[PDB]
Design a binder for this molecule. Structure first.
Ligand SMILES: Nc1ncnc2c1ncn2[C@@H]1O[C@H](COP(=O)(O)OP(=O)(O)O)[C@@H](O)[C@H]1O
Ligand SMILES: Nc1ncnc2c1ncn2[C@@H]1O[C@H](COP(=O)(O)OP(=O)(O)O)[C@@H](O)[C@H]1O
Ligand SMILES: Nc1ncnc2c1ncn2[C@@H]1O[C@H](COP(=O)(O)OP(=O)(O)O)[C@@H](O)[C@H]1O
Ligand SMILES: [Mg+2]
Ligand SMILES: [Mg+2]
Ligand SMILES: [Mg+2]
Ligand SMILES: [Mg+2]
Ligand SMILES: [Mg+2]
Lengths: 528, 98, 155, 526, 95, 532
């Protein structure tokens, strides 16, 4: 190095190039993977992360844990990004992607240290991943008769398998049945905004319920609200986007009068406008009035005098769910309130749930939405319950799209590893080592399962390898008996697309990391 | 060619093997290198590919010009020789179309 | 074990993974469970003296000097200035019991502290914490059924 | 919690960057003194850290006065010092050659050639270089004074002393010839110890001469002593001529009245006995490396003897060599053979405002002093450096009587021979061989650049001429910038100097090519 | 000091700025020749410019030697001789 | 709860940290292995520069903080002390062993099983080396020593210079040969004085048929060349006699002071006369000589050298047959010196070496000694030449002491890896894995050798393993055990045919030391770092 009186790049630029930087990138990926290892499997554990503000997040979800981590390593951010991608596309397997990518990099690291050209490793990864995806699609079990009973059983089993790693795994059957029931009621797009998630503190997990309709928290009742009846047996619901208050007609409106008679006429005209809106609402036959905009005390007392229910400032999502459940239409004007634009539910009731008042719309026969009311002893408890239910909902939706399942517990990966090793033993030998390394790296998930459960990983892996070699496809890790068992017969079912996406994303991340040979870091601007 | 992870002044990753992208994400301070970078960017704007070719050819030409200056040639003679050779290459190139 | 892993690479080059990783801390494995059990035990032992007819009140002082004398466990834990995350979890548990029922907000903390205290000596003997949680859930189901059995109705 | 493997201050650098940095540092070190080569070189002013000024064009002095941080630059400085110590000439040439070879090595290192191949090619090339240099050499009759003077002149035409060429050549030749010695079958020259250079600012440079003897900056101890003795008999001593304490603790115990006076009288009597022992040899001059007592001065003047005290040991050895005396420590053991007869005149004269002692008419003296008169201290220092170069070249010629054509003719001849030899290699290492062969052209190229002529045309013409059959002596005229024959111009240099330059340059390139990793900042751990 | 270090290799001449190590010491008290021997101050010389000037190596050498602080002064080897020092298994014959 | 004032690391964290430290130390010197290796240039932050390839020197010069890395550094130092060669190989092997053992441990294999497997693998590797991979030097002759020296001096600054330096080293080693009791030829290296001096090229390095002293005569009046030297070795200073602490001179009669002062020097004068009366020509003393005795020796036309090093004086006395005399005192209570105490040499000359002078004692009688004068371009190159020459001398000493050599170029490593991979299947179930990982770890040396040459390491090592597997399986093709790596062309080559040899003790000691270092580091699962 020489002073170079006129330096080329800006002062403070950091550059790392060659094999050492690739090894450092691999080590960083290993470090990132190590942070989420113990969260995988029914014997997994949760991680607690505290931000600068002092708030704590407790999660078993790999994507959430990685996001809460403030990763700044350029190569390590790839694992976080592929975890986010797996979460977005599938919703489950956010830990498997990171473990698989890190294990790929770990397996190919010794060849990197030996001076092997990265392009060869990338080609081997691409070939192995294509073969593995083809094998997954080939051996995935599907039934082409599609009856309601067996479809329900498959959905419930997939939901239980996706749920048997979280803190609600004790009530996994209950939660999975409830999640499948909620999902089956969505119409054609399976929109997540049509499934409500209400978290109410206090109460056990078994106290959580699914509403065959819509339910939302009471919204800032005005004076005179407590005189309105709080139960109806065949109400008609008027969904409005209207401000029912005494207010200026328009922001730029101005009234100019020069006689006291006109003054009184103007005051009475404002009152008559409000009362005309209220009378138009009342004459429609509706008994429950919900508005997106504030409802004043005058309107509240007017509706109370008519034995009618009012609720203003209802959020957008709650009104949308109410429209999709009862079957009305949101009206910005009350001039044409026909029976077509009026909702209908069998029973409306306001009850108390753990110190909160909730309005319930039940008995809807043709509802296309649902609302989850989750009970728990803590804020993060309910948050992680919601995350687990979201994972289960995503899995159930994907199963609805295509019921192609593979046995979990590492059985699918053992089959893939055996197939890949058999393929690799029949090629010249430069690609054979790398494909064998890929197959060996595919063993990470069952080994991690055994390690988390406290087993002896080596013996279980040996038994699994021997069983797969001698015949058997769905033999995986049996956590309860500390042994191996037929996971397909044990109903440890996974959608095939979960493993397909996991392998694809892990391979792409590994190829991207290997392809980089030089990293350059520009000096910071506006450090402050 | 191998991808390069380039981080600019705003913590933005740029992993790519595009020469123009790498140069524009690099804080180049030397003004002669600035001329060569502007030439590469002009090549990118006019055509769309060949920025790495432009940079490599310019670097090789400048090293060989340094060698020629060291052995005794003057700057003007080297410049005239490069101009004549560039004209000859432009004349030759159409005959190489396959 | 603490603060994470600091290697600075095996080639001498800088090894930065997480922003401000030198200023962050990390507890890994069984010692985290021991610390959490210890914190919960401390909170429960503080609460246990205010249980029953002969319980004694705690005399809370807020940041402004205002004085509150109370026996309500939920109120005491709400006004308690804690920093440990498990202590905050205990406070949230008391608030949950207050919201759902309104009574017994002190018994929940004592019961949780006793459960974690027993789980400590269960962990010391080489039992996976998930197994302890599953056994606790089974015993809780048994206790709930027994309560339903021995319950009595009033007019 | 700064857990680390190595120390915090340890810095490690490796790869292509280290090689590029080392080669660039060597190149820039060469570029520092590139312009100080040839008869048309320019002076450089060096500001010494201790406030002095060093004005010179010698490569070794300029490089020594420079402080550097890059270890490759330190290696180049050590190379220059080694070249100066071994032969005394060719420092600039060896630095430039090392830089050029490292440049042509970097050219290959940019490709995928391992440095070991380049080093092996360099070693083979160096062997062929030595062979060709020995081949194109010519013998010299050392008894021919004109040839020796011409060799010294060719050595000193590139220095500031070239304005006075005959005088400097005669001074150097006389000093080297009369410092030559042979005892017990062993031959020596010993320019370092004897043949002292004494510079007195003032006067004119044409007054500089080498004396047939020694000259010191000393005066008589007592003014009554003679300052001009015709044929002195000189006696040299180390022991003081004064009463000194014994080695052991020797406390006296006086209890009588006359013991104190007796002790003082015996001190005087011991001084008298030493003086009588010295006088017994009947000398004329007594020289001592230590003090001479006043009573000793009186007793010596009683015998008409000039005494000089506090002379440096090197000066006393030079006097002993010049006047044929033997240094004696005990006057009671003074033999006749120890008396120095052979000095033909001793004279104390004042130069400027300071007395100087001259013993300058010795017959067959084996040591001498070179009295330099000049304009100032810096000019005299440069003149002394040039005289040192001339004496080193004369000694090299006397020890090794082969000569090699100068003016870049040898460089071009060796380059052509190696290029012709490389045609039959038919291997992968032929390219570095030819490159390091052609790197020898940097010497004629630098000569032409300093002269101011056109480099490319002159190098092309010289190469074309050297492609002929008898043209190994065709080089570059340093003044007119024209192609001439060094058997006509007369510029010839010792084979030893060229051999040392070539070996040192090639081995410096080999040493610097071997490094590919740098770690620094660690404690000395002494 | 640089010149003195050549003839006195035993001494350990070192330099350090005042900033890295008071205000009154920085304004007009920078030149200090701190002499440390045995871990304690033997020479505490300050304001040395008054008795030195603004002086060559001879002046500083004399000033330090007049107080008996400079160690007593004591050939040029080729480069080096030693390579190690241990039980080097000197020559034997045995008959 | 511990309340220990310090930091504690437990479990996988400390194991990974130790492996990181060992791997970093290995990577420091991994680039200076084999002939295609390149040197490193160290700076001591005070301007001192050291260019070297020796692993021990590099690891000693560096300052290391982590203790697991200090273990490897002192392991390299121990390997240098007990063998003299293979200093980088042992460090690399130990680091690779630690890395693979840590991988096994992270795979939930108990460290005790890994250590037992490592011990078994080391024992069986040593046995296999001794029983299958040794070549006797009796049927090879001087060519074996020359080839061993050349192989040792590869990867050093005297590589291509090997054709000359190997002859020089072999002659120097054979010159100092002696046989002790039991008739065992013992070669006492470090008795070859290595003198360095910049100047002429490396080809001009001179091997002295005698001894070389880095000192000159004390007085310019003495002759600088004595033909028939009679060396007198002394261990006392020749100065003016001074009484000891227990003797004090007190004068009451003033007439005795002159006699006292005269005797103070007459004692030394009489000693000098007694020494010179036996015909002594060269006088060597460890102490100093004042000007008076220097003049005494000048008048006699004899050598006199002061401040001679003790080891140099002992070597000179042993070679020339002289006897060290710390004092002049016989068993009769007198003070005498006899001619039987005088050593003899065929010539003593003060020669000039690059503006400096040194004393050459040529052709000592009754015993032959040797010294080497290394000529280089600067101080750093001379130092590196000295280090490489010491390595070559140690290698030649090992080869001449134990007459077994092993093929070079990683052939031994590949053969051991194949044999141990085959052998692991016959022992245990988890120590099986430990032995397999030991075999895999032994492959790091050829991999590094191939990588340093910018060759395809994977293909070359695969071909080497195939050759050795064929040699081990087929019992009619056992000549392939000598197939190693030819880094010049990047092809497998019969190294025994090519003349690439190493002493067997190098491999054995390196394996044993690396195994112990790996076992020592692997035993740690917790670290407590007390705050100072
Ligand atoms: N009952 C079970 N038995 C064995 N393995 C299971 C069981 N349930 C889930 N798994 C395994 O857990 C892994 C996924 O763990 P989990 O944390 O639920 O999701 P993620 O993949 O997002 O980490 C799957 O590979 C699956 O094989
Ligand atoms: N009269 C001359 N004409 C042409 N070249 C000369 C003449 N005298 C000397 N030279 C060249 O100049 C070089 C000597 O340059 P010099 O300044 O002495 O460098 P250095 O001090 O390193 O020897 C020699 O190579 C010689 O060939
Ligand atoms: N000519 C050669 N050809 C192939 N391999 C060699 C040759 N010379 C040495 N080697 C190998 O290079 C390796 C490195 O040795 P080296 O690093 O010089 O020893 P040390 O480890 O003591 O520094 C040795 O194990 C040796 O087997
Ligand atoms: Mg999951
Ligand atoms: Mg392109
Ligand atoms: Mg109560
Ligand atoms: Mg010259
Ligand atoms: Mg070696």
């Amino acid at each position: 190095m020489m002073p170079t009186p006129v330096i080329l790049l800006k002062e403070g630029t950091d550059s790392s190039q060659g094999i050492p930087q690739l090894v450092s990138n691999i080590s960083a990926c290993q470090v990132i993977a190590e942070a989420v290892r113990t969260t995988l499997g029914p014997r997994g554990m949760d991680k607690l992360i505290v931000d600068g503000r002092g708030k704590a997040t407790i999660s078993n979800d790999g994507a959430t844990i990685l996001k809460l981590l403030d990763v700044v390593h350029p190569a390590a951010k790839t694992l976080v990004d592929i975890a986010k991608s797996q979460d977005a596309e599938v919703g489950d397997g956010t830990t498997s992607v990171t473990l698989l990518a890190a294990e790929f990099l770990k397996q190919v690291k010794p060849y990197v240290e030996e001076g092997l050209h990265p392009q060869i490793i990338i080609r081997a990864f691409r070939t192995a991943t294509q073969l593995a995806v083809n094998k997954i699609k080939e051996i995935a079990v599907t039934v082409k008769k599609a009856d309601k009973v067996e479809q329900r059983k498959l959905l419930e089993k997939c939901a239980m398998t996706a749920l048997s790693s979280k803190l609600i795994s004790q009530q996994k059957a209950f939660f999975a049945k409830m999640v499948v029931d909620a999902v089956m009621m969505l119409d054609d797009l399976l929109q997540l905004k049509m499934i409500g998630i209400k978290k109410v503190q206090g109460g056990a997990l078994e106290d959580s319920q699914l509403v065959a309709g819509v339910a939302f928290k009471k919204t800032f009742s005005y004076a005179g609200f407590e005189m309105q009846p709080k139960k109806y047996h065949n109400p008609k619901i008027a969904l409005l986007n209207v401000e029912l208050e005494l207010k200026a007609e328009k922001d730029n409106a101005e009234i100019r009068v020069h006689t006291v008679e006109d003054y009184q006429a103007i005051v009475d005209a404002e009152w008559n406008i409000l009362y005309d809106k209220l009378e138009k609402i009342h004459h429609s036959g509706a008994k429950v009035v919900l508005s997106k905009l504030p409802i004043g005390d005058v309107a509240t007392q007017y509706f109370a005098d008519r034995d009618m229910f009012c609720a203003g400032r209802v959020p957008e999502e709650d009104l949308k769910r109410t429209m999709m459940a009862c079957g009305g239409s949101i009206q910005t004007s009350v001039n044409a309130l026909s029976a077509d634009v009026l909702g209908r539910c069998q029973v409306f009731e306001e009850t108390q749930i753990g110190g909160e008042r909730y309005n319930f719309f039940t008995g809807c026969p043709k509802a296309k939405t649902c609302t989850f009311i989750l009970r728990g002893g803590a804020e993060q408890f309910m948050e992680e319950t919601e995350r687990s239910l979201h994972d289960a909902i995503m899995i159930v939706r994907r199963a609805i799209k295509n019921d192609s399942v593979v046995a979990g517990g590492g059985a699918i990966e053992m089959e893939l590893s055996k197939y890949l090793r058999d393929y690799s033993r029949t090629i010249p030998g430069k690609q054979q080592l790398l494909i064998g390394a890929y197959a060996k790296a595919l063993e990470i998930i069952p080994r991690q399962l055994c390690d988390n459960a406290g087993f002896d990983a080596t013996n279980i892996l040996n038994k699994l390898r021997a069983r797969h070699a001698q015949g058997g496809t769905w033999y995986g890790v049996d956590i309860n008996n500390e042994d191996i068992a037929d996971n397909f017969e044990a109903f440890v079912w996974e959608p095939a697309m979960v493993r397909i996406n996991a392998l694809t994303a892990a391979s792409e991340a590994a190829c991207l990391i290997v392809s980089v040979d030089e990293t350059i870091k520009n000096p910071r601007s506006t450090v402050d | 060619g191998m991808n390069k992870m380039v981080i600019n002044h705003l913590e933005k990753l740029f992993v790519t093997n595009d020469a123009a992208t790498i140069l524009r994400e690099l804080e180049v301070q030397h003004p002669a290198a600035k001329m060569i970078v502007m030439a590469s960017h002009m090549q990118e704007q006019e055509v769309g590919d060949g920025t790495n070719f432009v940079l490599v050819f310019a670097g090789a030409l400048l090293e060989l010009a340094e060698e020629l200056l060291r052995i005794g040639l003057s700057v003007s003679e080297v410049i005239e020789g490069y101009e004549i050779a560039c004209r000859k290459a432009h004349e030759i190139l159409p005959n190489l179309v396959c | 074990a603490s603060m994470g892993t600091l290697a600075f690479d095996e080639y001498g080059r800088p090894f930065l993974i997480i922003k401000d990783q030198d200023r962050k801390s990390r507890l890994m494995g069984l010692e985290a469970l021991k610390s959490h059990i210890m914190a919960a035990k401390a909170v429960a032992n503080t609460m246990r003296t205010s249980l029953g007819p002969n319980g004694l009140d705690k005399m809370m002082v807020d940041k402004d000097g205002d004085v509150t004398v109370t026996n309500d466990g939920a109120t005491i834990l709400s006004m308690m200035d804690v920093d440990h995350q498990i202590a905050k979890l205990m406070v949230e548990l008391s608030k949950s019991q207050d919201d759902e029922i309104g009574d017994g907000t002190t018994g929940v903390v004592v019961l949780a502290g006793a459960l974690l205290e027993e789980a400590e000596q269960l962990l010391d003997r080489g039992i996976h914490p998930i197994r302890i949680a599953d056994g606790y859930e089974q015993a809780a189901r048994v206790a709930i059924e027994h309560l339903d059995k021995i319950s009595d109705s009033v007019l | 919690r700064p857990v680390l493997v190595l120390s915090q201050n340890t810095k490690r650098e490796s790869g292509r960057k280290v090689q590029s940095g080392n080669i660039n540092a060597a190149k820039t070190i060469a570029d520092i003194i590139r312009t100080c080569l040839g008869p048309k070189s320019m002076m450089k002013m060096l500001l010494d850290p201790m406030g002095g000024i060093v004005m010179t064009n010698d490569g070794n002095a300029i490089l020594r006065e420079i402080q550097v941080q890059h270890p490759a630059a330190k290696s180049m400085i050590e190379i220059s010092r080694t070249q100066d110590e071994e032969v005394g000439d060719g420092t600039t040439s060896v630095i430039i050659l090392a830089g050029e070879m490292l440049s042509v090595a970097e050219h290959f290192l940019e490709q995928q050639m391992h440095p070991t191949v380049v080093i092996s090619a360099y070693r083979k090339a160096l062997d062929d270089m030595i062979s060709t240099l020995k081949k194109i050499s010519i013998p010299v009759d050392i008894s021919d004074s004109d040839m020796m003077l011409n060799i010294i002149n060719s050595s000193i035409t590139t220095k500031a002393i070239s304005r006075w060429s005959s005088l400097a050549c005669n001074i150097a030749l006389d000093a080297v010839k009369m410092v030559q010695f042979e005892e017990n079958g062993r031959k020596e020259i010993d320019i370092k110890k004897y043949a002292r250079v004494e510079k007195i600012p003032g006067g004119i440079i044409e007054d500089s001469c080498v004396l047939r003897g020694v000259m010191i900056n000393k005066d008589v101890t007592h003014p009554r002593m003679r300052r001009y003795i015709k044929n002195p008999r000189i006696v040299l001593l180390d022991s003081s001529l004064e009463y000194k304490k014994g080695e052991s603790q020797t406390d006296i115990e006086i209890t009588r009245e006359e013991d104190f006076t007796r002790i003082l009288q015996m001190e005087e009597e011991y001084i008298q006995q030493l003086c009588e022992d010295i006088i017994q040899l009947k000398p004329d001059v007594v020289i001592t490396e230590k003090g001479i007592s006043d009573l000793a001065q009186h007793y010596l003047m009683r015998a008409n003897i000039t005494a000089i005290r506090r002379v440096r040991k090197t000066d006393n050895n030079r006097i002993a060599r010049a006047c044929g005396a033997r240094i004696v420590s005990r006057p009671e053991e003074l033999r006749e053979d120890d008396v120095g007869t052979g000095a033909g005149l001793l004279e104390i004269k004042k130069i400027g405002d300071e007395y100087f002692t001259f013993i300058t008419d010795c017959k067959d003296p084996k040591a001498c002093t070179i009295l330099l008169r000049g304009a100032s201290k810096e000019i005299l220092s440069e003149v002394e450096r040039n005289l040192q170069d001339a004496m080193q070249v004369c000694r090299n010629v006397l020890l090794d009587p082969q000569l090699v054509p100068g003016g870049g003719a040898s460089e071009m001849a060796v380059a052509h021979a190696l290029t012709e030899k490389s045609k039959a290699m038919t291997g992968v290492e032929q390219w570095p061989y030819r490159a390091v062969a052609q790197a020898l052209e940097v010497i004629p190229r630098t000569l032409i650049q300093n002269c101011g002529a056109s480099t490319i045309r002159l190098l092309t013409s010289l190469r074309a001429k050297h492609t002929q059959e008898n043209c190994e002596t065709w080089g570059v005229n340093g003044e007119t910038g024209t192609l001439v024959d060094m058997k006509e111009l007369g510029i010839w240099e010792p084979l030893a100097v060229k051999l040392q330059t070539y070996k040192t340059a090639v081995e410096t390139a080999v040493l610097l090519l071997r490094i590919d990793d740098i770690v620094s900042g660690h404690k000395k751990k002494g | 000091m640089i010149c003195l270090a050549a003839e006195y290799p035993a001494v350990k001449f070192c330099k350090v700025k005042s900033s890295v190590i008071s205000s009154q010491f920085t304004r007009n008290a920078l030149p200090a020749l701190l002499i440390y021997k045995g871990g304690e101050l033997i020479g505490n010389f300050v304001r040395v410019t008054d008795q030195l000037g603004d002086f060559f190596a001879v002046d500083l050498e004399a000033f330090l030697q007049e107080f008996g602080l400079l160690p007593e002064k004591e050939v040029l080897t080729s480069v080096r001789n030693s390579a190690t020092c241990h039980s080097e298994d000197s020559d034997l014959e045995i008959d | 709860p511990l309340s220990v004032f310090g930091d504690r690391s437990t479990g996988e964290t400390i194991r990974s940290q130790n492996v990181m430290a060992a791997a970093s130390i290995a990577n420091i010197v991994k680039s200076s292995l084999g002939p295609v290796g390149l040197d490193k240039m160290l700076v001591d932050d005070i301007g001192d520069v050291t260019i070297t390839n020796d692993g021990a020197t590099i690891l000693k010069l560096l300052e290391v903080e982590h203790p697991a890395a200090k273990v490897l550094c002192e392991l390299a130092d121990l390997q240098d002390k007990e063998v003299g060669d293979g200093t980088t190989s042992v460090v690399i092997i130990a680091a690779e062993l630690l890395k693979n053992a840590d991988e096994l441990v992270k795979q939930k294999i108990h460290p005790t099983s890994v250590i037992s497997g490592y011990r078994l693998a080391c024992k069986e590797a040593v046995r296999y080396i001794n029983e299958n991979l040794i070549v006797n030097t009796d049927e090879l002759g001087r060519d074996c020593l020359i080839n061993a020296a050349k192989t040792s001096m590869s990867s050093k600054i005297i590589g291509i210079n090997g054709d000359f330096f190997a002859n020089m080293v072999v002659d120097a080693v054979l010159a100092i040969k002696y046989t002790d009791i039991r008739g065992q030829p013992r070669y006492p290296v470090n008795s070859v004085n290595i003198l360095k001096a910049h100047g002429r090229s490396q080809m001009e390095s001179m091997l002295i048929s005698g001894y070389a002293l880095n000192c000159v005569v004390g007085s310019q009046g003495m002759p600088k060349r004595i033909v028939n030297a009679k060396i007198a070795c002394l261990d006392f200073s020749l100065q003016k006699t001074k009484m000891k602490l227990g003797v004090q001179v007190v004068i009451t009669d003033p007439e005795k002071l002159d006699q006292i002062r005269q005797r103070e020097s007459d004692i030394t004068k009489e000693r000098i006369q007694k020494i010179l009366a036996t015909g002594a020509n060269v006088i060597l003393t460890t102490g100093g000589i004042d000007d008076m005795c220097l003049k005494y020796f000048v008048e006699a036309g004899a050598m006199a050298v002061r401040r001679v090093l003790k080891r140099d004086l002992k070597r000179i006395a042993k070679a020339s047959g002289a006897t060290i005399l710390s004092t002049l005192a016989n068993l009769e209570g007198e003070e005498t010196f006899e001619a039987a105490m005088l050593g003899q040499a065929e010539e003593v000359v003060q020669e000039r070496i690059c503006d400096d002078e040194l004393i050459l004692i040529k052709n000592t009688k009754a015993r032959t000694s040797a010294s080497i004068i290394l000529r280089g371009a600067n101080d750093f190159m001379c130092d590196e030449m000295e280090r490489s020459l010491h390595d070559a001398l140690c290698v030649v000493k090992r080869v001449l002491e134990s007459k077994s050599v092993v093929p070079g170029g990683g052939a031994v490593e590949a053969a051991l890896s194949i044999y141990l991979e085959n052998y692991a299947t016959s022992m245990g179930s988890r120590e099986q894995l430990a032995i397999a990982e030991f075999a895999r770890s032994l492959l790091v040396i050829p991999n590094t050798l191939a990588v340093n040459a910018a060759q395809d390491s994977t293909d070359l090592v695969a071909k080497l393993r195939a050759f050795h597997n064929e040699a081990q399986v087929n019992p009619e093709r056992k000549n392939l055990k000598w197939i190693g790596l030819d880094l010049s062309n990047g092809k497998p080559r019969d190294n025994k045919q090519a003349g690439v040899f190493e002493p067997t003790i190098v491999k054995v000691k390196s394996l044993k030391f690396a195994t112990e270092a790996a076992i020592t580091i692997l035993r740690i699962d917790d670290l407590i770092k007390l705050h100072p």
